Design a protein around this ligand. Structure first.
Ligand SMILES: [Cl-]
Ligand SMILES: [Cl-]
Ligand SMILES: [Cl-]
Ligand SMILES: [Cl-]
Lengths: 479, 472
């Protein structure tokens, strides 16, 4: 009876692609650019974690130094994006190109000039930049000198950075987001999440949980202040949060499983609660008191939080989680997740849950009643370039199709308000988890090996063509 | 731990009833015939017969009930001894407007509630009033088609205005429509009659007419919040929601999405009551099913300005669902057993439901129904040992206590259902008992109607006098 084929996405829908500066740009030293926390992360494997080193240690390979050299090649890459018909380009402004060490009193003109040029290049091509301010690339100086977001000073260092960007680019960007995947540090035991989100490398004697919430608080306050500041520079600016949206199912209908899963979602998405409601949920305030965290939270902080709630919720989606009741009060993401036996290998071997995206979209809408922006979704897989220089990546086409199907249902049937959709790593870039080029997400193949060798030549994948057609038909054919 | 910690200062402990389930005096003081007054006695496997007015030869248990209309002084004596802070009841619509469409209220019905409320207030017990509680005038059902008809909005408002004005110095908490979301089960004739005064006409699209009637009710609720706030700006005017949380049976993504939609369907009423607008998924449904409902721009403006001050709710059970394959939730066919709950009583769902309401709406809550229906036996020495009832209420109160003290849910009070044994809604039986007070009435209406304290009476007395501090 009901069908979605033949029906277009809404008019004005922002199809695009998504990246982060540190994962594609390279030129990590060009133009007086500072050493970021991305620049101290060595290459790893599927089995071997990336090494966080103290500065650039000698005889180690850092894949973010060159990446795919987009700092220099962006006009060629953007032409490929306009050939696909992108309506937007989601990327980050490297904090380290604008304030290399993060505490300077004036910005870096060479860095500001780069984004002028990059954005001018997008805009003459019909492509509006969608910009994330903090994206796992903060000045390492801030980590060494201040202890990262342990320190309330980062609130003003962040705002200096946002101010300069808001003003410089105020006729060039409409959509901004403050802190990429701010809620990864929900897993406070993940060294990767503490560094990327908050620039925290654990010190002996520290309560990891306590300092995550201290750090998240300051960032949430910084985000709220940036919304207000932002709206003052350009009232047309749409300013959003960025949430990693892994929904957490109860394993079974056992009441205690269902309650525990509620508390896991509450714990993982309190960040969104603050961004959107302007206040801390009361259960978490109660947790702050009963664990005696004694957090540095001022009455000024709370007023800023309540005036600086966001215009929309940008999120990533990749997977869903499952939990059963542990007997325990709190959700610890490192230890409490169980296997979901109802989700099995797809035709291509990897597990996905496209239904959870629909679920997630209804969960955001019914809770906050704000527009959403899907700014990260994609398949990381091995691609082979054939002798005749093609990549037949129908495993990537299927992946995106299965997800787009559910998104199309969420919007057309469920009536969820979606600004757009920008699949992750539209051009093959350095993967966050391992720093391998080999784990590829792109519509565009970049001839680079994991050791950084290769010509770096761009080639179209078959998915490039499939996605061009989707944009050209505004998603009408998706069934 | 929570052991030794009190509920918040001023927590409204009490008991709840509905005028039609306990008053009796169904023709007294010019009282009109209600929809409760046309329902015969039934059992578990035998629906209450609906009749067209009162037929001779049939027994109607609500006609007499437990005679609280004449016995309220004795009965309130027992509530005051138990130590109630509030008494949650309905004002019988047919006592104030017998046919429902009169231009003037009935002075004797109004004076009954003056007498009743003053009797409560002289003992430190504040009334908490639900305006529509399954007892609308049968004149409105018969001649207008109940809430199928837009004219009922004004009829409700004439009723509400009068009650707000008359009891302005005597009632702080009000609620508009009892369990407004029972009619989610649009295949349920009982739910349709009790919520919306709809006796089915063949040819009629049940679901469509539900949505239409529920719309006018939501509009009337919105408009009465504004009216009451104008009459006494210190009034708290809430909704009343039947909170049956719906669990996915397994973590299968299709089961999880279906449970989301099941709860979206069942609780959109709450969405409209609190958010002040229709959820977009449902509006889309109105379009794709071609309901062509009567919804004006003016309706949408009243709704948005008339959102409630708090959420009143009943809690008895949770439901479970698996994916059916279908696009829509049908509550008459789509529920499956929860194999993880003892043989569906579920105290932890209460805690869940409280967080759910709180995280979704961020409004204060009021638990206005909760309790255990059971066959109570009176011993030869006139004791009722309802240890099962104390266990049930303790299990629920413990979950309520965690929700409030740890989870920081904003709870106004707690009034268990049927604090004095009354006529059950499901069957019209006395023998399915909920009370702290046992009433000696058989299902055919015979007996002394004498009152006795069940063991739970003294238990709840001590819960109140310690403000829940021993609950662990
Ligand atoms: Cl998954
Ligand atoms: Cl990274
Ligand atoms: Cl659905
Ligand atoms: Cl929610």
């Amino acid at each position: 009876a009901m069908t979605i084929k033949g029906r277009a996405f809404p008019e004005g829908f922002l199809w695009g692609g998504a990246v982060a500066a540190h994962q594609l740009e390279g030129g990590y030293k060009e133009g007086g650019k500072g050493l970021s926390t991305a620049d101290i992360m060595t290459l790893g494997t599927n089995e071997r974690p990336r090494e966080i080193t103290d500065g650039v240690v000698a005889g180690k390979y850092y894949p973010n130094h060159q990446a795919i050299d987009f700092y220099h090649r962006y006009p060629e890459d953007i032409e490929l994006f306009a050939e696909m018909g992108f309506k937007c380009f989601r990327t980050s402004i490297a904090w380290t190109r604008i304030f290399p060490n993060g505490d300077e009193s004036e910005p870096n003109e060479a860095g500001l000039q780069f984004y002028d040029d990059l954005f001018d290049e997008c805009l003459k091509n019909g492509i509006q930049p969608v910009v994330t301010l903090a994206h796992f690339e903060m000045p390492y100086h801030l980590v060494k000198q201040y202890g990262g977001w342990r320190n309330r000073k980062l609130i003003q260092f962040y705002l200096n950075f946002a101010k300069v960007c808001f003003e410089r680019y105020r006729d060039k960007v409409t959509y901004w987001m403050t802190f990429n995947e701010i809620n990864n540090q929900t897993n406070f035991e993940s060294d990767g999440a503490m560094l990327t989100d908050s620039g925290i490398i654990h010190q002996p004697g520290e309560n990891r949980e306590r300092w995550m919430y201290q750090a998240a608080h300051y960032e949430l306050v910084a985000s709220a202040a940036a919304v207000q500041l932002g709206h003052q520079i350009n009232p047309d600016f749409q300013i959003g949060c960025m949430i990693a949206m892994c929904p957490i199912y109860p394993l079974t209908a056992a009441p205690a499983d269902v309650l525990f899963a509620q508390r896991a979602m509450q714990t993982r998405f309190y960040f969104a609660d603050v961004h959107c409601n302007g206040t801390y949920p009361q259960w978490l305030r109660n947790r702050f008191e009963s664990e005696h965290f004694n957090l540095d939270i001022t009455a000024e902080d709370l007023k800023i939080l309540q005036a600086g709630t966001v215009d929309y919720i940008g999120f990533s989606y990749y997977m869903s989680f499952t939990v059963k009741d542990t007997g325990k009060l709190a959700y610890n993401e490192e230890h409490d997740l169980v296997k979901n036996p109802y989700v099995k290998a797809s035709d291509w071997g990897w597990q996905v849950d496209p239904v959870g995206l629909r679920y997630a979209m209804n969960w955001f809408t019914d809770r906050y009643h704000l527009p959403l922006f899907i700014v990260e979704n994609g398949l990381g897989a091995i691609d082979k370039k054939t002798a005749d220089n093609q990549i037949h990546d129908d495993y990537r086409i299927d992946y995106l199709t299965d997800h787009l199907r559910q998104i199309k249902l969420a919007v057309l049937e469920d009536g969820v308000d979606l600004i757009g959709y920008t699949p992750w790593g539209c051009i093959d870039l350095v993967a966050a988890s391992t720093g391998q080029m080999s784990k590829r997400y792109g519509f565009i193949y970049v001839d680079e090996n994991d050791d950084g060798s290769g010509s770096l030549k761009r080639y179209k994948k078959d998915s490039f063509t499939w996605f061009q057609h989707v944009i050209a038909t505004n998603g009408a054919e998706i069934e």
